[PDB]
């Protein structure tokens, strides 16, 4: 029944404590300790906005990775001197 | 001298006792045998001898 709860044990990777949301100091120090994450998000916000804009396309492309895996392997044979294919259609 | 405290008998009852020096709790006396080392010091050369 030894108690281990304290401000010393807490690190920046720990999750929040549901009991101590009411304590204002706990929430304020919770936000203050994890400023590297907020700064990392803030410095690169344009990239996140662009990715959010292009989200639908990425969404579509995700269902079709498996086919592209085989198509990428086939590409090397698929080259086949593409100009020859017009003649092949002719013949 | 905490190490001496740990590794010691520290029992008051002892067989050693000097009759020539018997005193109560009132008496306090500094020993006559002062213990002091000798250190290196540069001569002053301002105090002319």
């Amino acid at each position: 029944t030894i108690p281990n709860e304290g401000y010393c044990c807490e690190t920046l990777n720990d999750p929040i404590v549901d009991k101590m949301i009411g304590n204002a100091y706990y929430v304020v120090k919770f936000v203050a300790l994890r400023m590297p994450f907020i700064k990392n998000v803030s410095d690169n916000m344009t990239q996140l906005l662009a990715i959010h804009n292009k989200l639908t396309e990425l969404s579509a492309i995700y269902t079709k990775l498996d086919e592209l895996q085989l198509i990428h392997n086939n590409l090397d044979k698929l080259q086949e001197l593409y100009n020859q294919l017009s003649k092949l259609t002719g013949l | 001298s905490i190490e001496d405290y740990l590794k010691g008998k520290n029992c008051l009852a002892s067989p050693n006792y000097d009759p020539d020096d018997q005193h109560s709790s009132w008496r306090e006396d500094l020993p006559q045998f002062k213990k002091d080392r000798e250190h290196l010091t540069l001569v002053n050369t301002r105090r002319n001898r």
């Binding site: - | 002091d36 080392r37 000798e38 250190h39 290196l40 010091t41 540069l42 001569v43 050369t45």
Partner: protein, 103 residues
């Protein structure tokens, strides 16, 4: 060559550590006594110690205080014979040995 310089080969040793005293670090000074007794396997009966080095006499006071601390550590360890390094420096700087004042 560590193998050749072991106790059965040579009767006694003389040890010098000037860099520690000159730099004044004084925390790694106890290592030399341990090295002499154990690593080289020489008895404490025959160990000779040389203390201190004072060049550029304008730096006498700090180095001689470091020499005092080193001599204190050496006396604590129990070395039989101890040497100030040189006659020239000792006579030039006027080193004398006296009990410290009590105040």
């Amino acid at each position: 060559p560590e193998s050749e310089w072991i106790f059965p080969n040579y009767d006694f040793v003389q040890i010098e550590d000037y860099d520690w005293i000159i730099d004044g670090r004084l925390d790694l000074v106890p290592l030399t006594f341990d090295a002499a007794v154990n690593r080289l396997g020489y008895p404490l009966n025959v160990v000779h110690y040389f203390i201190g080095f004072v060049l550029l006499p304008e730096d006498a006071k700090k180095i001689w205080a470091d020499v005092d601390k080193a001599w204190g550590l050496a006396l604590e360890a129990g070395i039989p014979h101890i040497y100030p390094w040189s006659y020239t420096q000792v006579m030039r700087d006027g080193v004398i040995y006296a009990v410290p004042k009590v105040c």
